[PDB]
Amino acid sequence: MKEYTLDKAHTDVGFKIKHLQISNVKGCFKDYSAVIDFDPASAEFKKLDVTIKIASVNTENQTRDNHLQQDDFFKAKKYPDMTFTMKKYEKIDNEKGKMTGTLTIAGVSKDIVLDAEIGGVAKGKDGKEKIGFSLNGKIKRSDFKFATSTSTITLSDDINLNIEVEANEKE
Amino acid sequence: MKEYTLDKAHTDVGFKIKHLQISNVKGCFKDYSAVIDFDPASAEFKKLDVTIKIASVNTENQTRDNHLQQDDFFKAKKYPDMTFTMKKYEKIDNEKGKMTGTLTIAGVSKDIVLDAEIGGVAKGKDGKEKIGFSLNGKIKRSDFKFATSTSTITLSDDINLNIEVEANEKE
Amino acid sequence: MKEYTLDKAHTDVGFKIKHLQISNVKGCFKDYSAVIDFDPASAEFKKLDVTIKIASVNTENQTRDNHLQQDDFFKAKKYPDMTFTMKKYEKIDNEKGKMTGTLTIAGVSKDIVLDAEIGGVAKGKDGKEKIGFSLNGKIKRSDFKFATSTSTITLSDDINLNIEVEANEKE
Amino acid sequence: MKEYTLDKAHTDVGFKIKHLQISNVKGCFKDYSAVIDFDPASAEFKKLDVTIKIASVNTENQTRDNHLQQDDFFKAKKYPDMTFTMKKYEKIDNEKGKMTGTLTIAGVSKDIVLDAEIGGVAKGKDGKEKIGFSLNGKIKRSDFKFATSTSTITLSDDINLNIEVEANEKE
Numbered sequence: 113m114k115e116y117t118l119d120k121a122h123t124d125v126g127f128k129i130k131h132l133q134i135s136n137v138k139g140c141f142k143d144y145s146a147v148i149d150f151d152p153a154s155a156e157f158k159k160l161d162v163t164i165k166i167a168s169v170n171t172e173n174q175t176r177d178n179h180l181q182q183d184d185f186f187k188a189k190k191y192p193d194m195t196f197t198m199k200k201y202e203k204i205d206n207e208k209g210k211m212t213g214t215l216t217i218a219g220v221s222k223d224i225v226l227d228a229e230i231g232g233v234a235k236g237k238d239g240k241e242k243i244g245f246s247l248n249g250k251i252k253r254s255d256f257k258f259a260t261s262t263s264t265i266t267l268s269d270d271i272n273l274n275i276e277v278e279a280n281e282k283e
Numbered sequence: 284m285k286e287y288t289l290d291k292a293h294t295d296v297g298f299k300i301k302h303l304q305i306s307n308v309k310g311c312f313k314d315y316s317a318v319i320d321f322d323p324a325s326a327e328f329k330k331l332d333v334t335i336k337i338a339s340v341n342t343e344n345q346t347r348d349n350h351l352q353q354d355d356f357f358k359a360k361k362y363p364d365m366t367f368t369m370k371k372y373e374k375i376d377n378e379k380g381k382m383t384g385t386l387t388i389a390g391v392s393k394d395i396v397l398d399a400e401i402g403g404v405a406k407g408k409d410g411k412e413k414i415g416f417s418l419n420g421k422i423k424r425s426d427f428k429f430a431t432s433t434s435t436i437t438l439s440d441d442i443n444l445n446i447e448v449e450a451n452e453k454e
Numbered sequence: 455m456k457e458y459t460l461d462k463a464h465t466d467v468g469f470k471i472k473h474l475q476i477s478n479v480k481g482c483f484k485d486y487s488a489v490i491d492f493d494p495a496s497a498e499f500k501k502l503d504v505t506i507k508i509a510s511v512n513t514e515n516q517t518r519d520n521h522l523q524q525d526d527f528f529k530a531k532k533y534p535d536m537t538f539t540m541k542k543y544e545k546i547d548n549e550k551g552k553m554t555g556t557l558t559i560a561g562v563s564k565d566i567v568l569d570a571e572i573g574g575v576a577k578g579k580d581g582k583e584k585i586g587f588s589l590n591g592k593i594k595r596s597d598f599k600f601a602t603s604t605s606t607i608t609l610s611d612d613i614n615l616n617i618e619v620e621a622n623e624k625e
Numbered sequence: 626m627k628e629y630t631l632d633k634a635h636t637d638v639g640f641k642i643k644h645l646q647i648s649n650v651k652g653c654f655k656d657y658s659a660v661i662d663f664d665p666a667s668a669e670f671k672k673l674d675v676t677i678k679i680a681s682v683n684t685e686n687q688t689r690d691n692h693l694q695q696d697d698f699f700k701a702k703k704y705p706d707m708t709f710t711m712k713k714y715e716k717i718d719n720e721k722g723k724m725t726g727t728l729t730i731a732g733v734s735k736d737i738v739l740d741a742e743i744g745g746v747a748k749g750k751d752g753k754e755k756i757g758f759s760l761n762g763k764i765k766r767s768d769f770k771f772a773t774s775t776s777t778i779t780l781s782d783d784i785n786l787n788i789e790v791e792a793n794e795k796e
Contacts, residue, residue: 114322116320118315118316118448119450124445124447125446127311127444128307128442129307129442130438132303136299149284265476265778270300270612276295279290280290304778421763434647455671458663459794460659461793468652469652471650472647473781476643481641491626491629504638609642612643613642618636618639
């Protein structure tokens with residue numbers, strides 16, 4: 113038998129334990145087109161049709177962006193774009209309204225409601241019109257059978273849409 | 284009615300979605316004492332008694348370290364230290380053995396098994412002995428009623444102990 | 455050495471593995487009062503004030519119901535009731551409107567929006583009025599600092615309110 | 626304007642909220658073979674080779690059992706069986722030892738340690754031998770690239786093996 117004394121310098125009294133952390137993935141699409149018809153006399157939208165290039169997704173992370181293009185997500189080879197078509201604008205007051213439209217993700221289509229908030233109507237520097245509105249709402253992955261392989265535990269069924277638009281008159 | 288054109292520069296076609304991520308919290312205790320009796324003739328431990336100062340926890344994050352001291356974790360005011368007392372060493376061969384001891388966390392005591400791996404026995408520079416062994420095993424939070432308020436979902440019931448010792452002879 | 459043959463009848467080649475499952479807790483309150491003022495000429499609400507007895511919660515499980523009364527949930531001893539006061543009804547059409555009100559949970563108050571859906575206005579059997587409407591919306595635990603000890607991982611931050619009312623005229 | 630009174634009988638003041646629950650999936654395999662060589666003079670295993678028919682899995686649920694056979698789990702069409710081959714038994718005492726062997730799941734092979742606990746050696750009714758031992762240990766899905774598509778969040782990386790054997794002498 114013999115007696116020893118730790119050498120605290122080259123000793124580590126260590127442990128490891130696993131925990132979960134919830135976090136928000138934020139994202140936009142860098143490339144999209146839209147047709148916007150709006151009547152500033154009445155603060156009503158008349159037509160709003162958006163097309164978004166799935167390839168232009170950005171979640172400040174190049175490897176996840178790539179992964180979003182694959183079979184378990186968007187399938188951008190087969191379905192390069194997502195589209196929104198307004199079907200109905202129901203005015204609440206001049207600042208607020210309920211927008212109903214058809215969202216299409218990887219060829220699956222559902223009618224959604226977005227909350228229109230008109231944050232400012234103006235005549236610009238040059239005397240031609242501008243507008244600044246937002247569109248906000250929550251869609252469910254499951255309504256669109258989006259990423260069905262991924263559990264609703266790992267990744268939320270709820271996606272929150274925040275569309276922030278500034279926009280100038282035409283021609 | 285009027286027609287607008289997005290100003291892509293001050294437009295954000297955005298979304299937010301929540302996901303979970305699993306991660307390992309790694310940690311040690313910076314301050315502890317131990318009594319080590321070991322027989323290099325037979326590669327058997329004779330006595331191993333450790334006392335650890337809960338206050339000296341380190342998980343490379345000062346606010347979590349603090350939080351670990353509180354009622355929902357260690358309760359360092361009431362129970363400043365955790366202790367391990369070897370009760371039995373069962374040799375497998377000269378490199379490996381099964382250690383049984385009594386672990387005490389916030390005044391609750393359970394007998395645990397650690398896997399002893401002797402990574403090297405030597406006479407040092409000066410002709411006085413050294414040893415380098417490891418102690419590894421898994422304990423359950425629930426066996427010790429540790430952090431009972433925290434769910435086994437958020438934070439794993441399993442803690443993995445990795446004790447890495449280098450140690451020199453006495454007097 | 456000797457050779458054996460399993461007795462499959464008293465042998466179990468077994469395993470255990472842990473998984474998570476997401477599920478909806480559904481609930482109502484069995485006891486509450488309300489004051490309802492509604493104008494069937496215009497399909498507008500004028501006043502809607504609800505008081506709910508937290509003690510009357512029902513989630514088809516007596517031990518959870520009890521637990522909901524405690525410090526980590528409602529604190530029914532200190533705060534026996536939750537209240538909603540309408541502040542604004544904004545008509546969309548005769549079937550739909552946006553209700554804004556003040557919800558109070560354990561003494562914390564936030565303005566919320568509920569989606570009013572009028573599912574049917576009538577003169578009853580006896581020639582006195584009835585109505586059937588629904589109120590739907592999502593509130594965040596965190597907005598009300600409700601159950602702050604419970605993680606948003608274990609239990610969702612989002613609560614979905616589904617108020618389904620049938621109601622007859624007064625006196 | 627008009628005043629109404631709830632009809633509590635056809636009113637529901639309701640809510641829905643999502644929570645997670647952890648649970649153990651328990652399972653065995655109903656059909657398997659083994660070769661067992663054991664020396665009761667010394668309480669040492671000499672040979673232990675097991676083959677398990679993946680098709681015979683049982684987790685008291687027919688739809689999960691089926692699902693376990695598919696590409697995202699066992700792939701029973703391509704790999705109908707899992708095998709264990711003992712490579713080393715290291716005696717601790719007559720009741721306990723450390724078994725090292727090669728486990729093969731869907732064609733991937735890893736050396737694992739199981740804790741042998743001999744719960745009883747005997748001469749039977751007829752004067753021919755019996756034994757009752759258990760084999761216990763933890764394996765990681767990831768070590769075998771098992772169910773790689775399923776997250777370690779949803780389903781634990783750790784599987785706990787509990788093999789409970791009773792067994793009679795040969796010929």
